[PDB]
Amino acid sequence: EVETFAFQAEIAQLMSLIINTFYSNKEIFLRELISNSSDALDKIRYESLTDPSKLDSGKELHINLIPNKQDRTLTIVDTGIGMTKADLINNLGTIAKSGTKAFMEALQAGADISMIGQFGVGFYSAYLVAEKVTVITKHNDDEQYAWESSAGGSFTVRTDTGEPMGRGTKVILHLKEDQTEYLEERRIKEIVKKHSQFIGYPITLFVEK
């Protein structure tokens, strides 16, 4: 059973700007998604300080980067707090309407796309490199769900029958044909070292057969 939703107009406009603006510094998508994972891990860690049972769904707090050249996907997995169905529908747990308003003002006031994370909407930088994004998520208080969008003004949500996750979020980037450098080990390592060197969780770059 698949539910299809329209993006709020302001979010559709944000996505269109990300997809259509000429902007060469696309590699920041990875910094933004790793930062979101770190924020999600901080949240479950904080809850666990007063309620250790919050980690019954998984004690390890980490980030995995999983390239797959056969599927043309880069997957960012974290064991953070995850998202409820309501969070997914409400712009993946962001205040994206107000964040977009500020971001678009800043761009007209001199800012560039790399600054997107200062406005709480860094997730959408995935569309710098991905033609489709799938988000699989499991929060302690809800079931496992899959969100997906190829932009174009709509997203879907369905219960996920795939591999159970325990707790956290998996962002699957279905890369554009001309963006496959982001599956190359040396390129990913370079981006992590440049932009994510102070993230306080282990970031494991998986290798391929």
Ligand X SMILES: Clc1ccc(-c2cnco2)cn1
Indicate the residue among 11 and 128 with the shorter CB distance to ligand X: 128
Residues numbered 80-119 forming contacts with ligand X, rule: CB under 6 A: 104, 107, 113, 116
Q: How many residues bind ligand X (CB under 6 A)?
A: 10
Options 4-12, 18-26, 48-56, 137-145: segment touching ligand X (CB under 6 A): 18-26
Tokens standing for residue 167: 């707790």
- Shortest separation between residue 37's beta carbon and ligand X, angstroms: 18
Taking CB under 6 A as the rule, does residue 23 contact ligand X? yes
Indicate the residue among 124 and 145 with the shorter CB distance to ligand X: 124
Taking CB under 6 A as the rule, does residue 19 contact ligand X? no
The DSSP annotation for 81-92 comes to ----HHHHHTGG
Taking CB under 6 A as the rule, does residue 129 contact ligand X? no
- Distance, in Å, from the CA atom of 180 to the CA atom of 122, rounded to the nearest integer, reads 21
Choose, by CB under 6 A, the member of 79, 91, 125, 137 that binds ligand X.
125
The bridge status of strand 73-78 relative to strand 168-175 is antiparallel
Taking CB under 6 A as the rule, does residue 169 contact ligand X? no
Could you tell me which of 170, 171, 127 has the C-alpha nearest to residue 29? Answer: 127
Choose, by CB under 6 A, the member of 12, 17, 66, 102 that binds ligand X.
17
Can you name the residues that pair with 168 across neighbouring β-strands? 138
CB atoms within 10 A of CB 103: 24
Using CB positions, name the residue nearest to ligand X: 113
The DSSP annotation for 103-148 comes to HHHHHHTT--GGGGGGGT-GGGGGGGTEEEEEEEEE-TTS--EEEE
- Shortest separation between residue 127's beta carbon and ligand X, angstroms: 8
For residue 163, give the DSSP letter: S
- Shortest separation between residue 104's beta carbon and ligand X, angstroms: 6
Q: Distance of CA 115 to CAs 47, 50, 52, 77, 179, Å?
A: 29, 34, 36, 23, 21
Residue ranges in contact with ligand X by CB under 6 A: 17-18, 21, 23, 104, 107, 113, 116, 125, 128
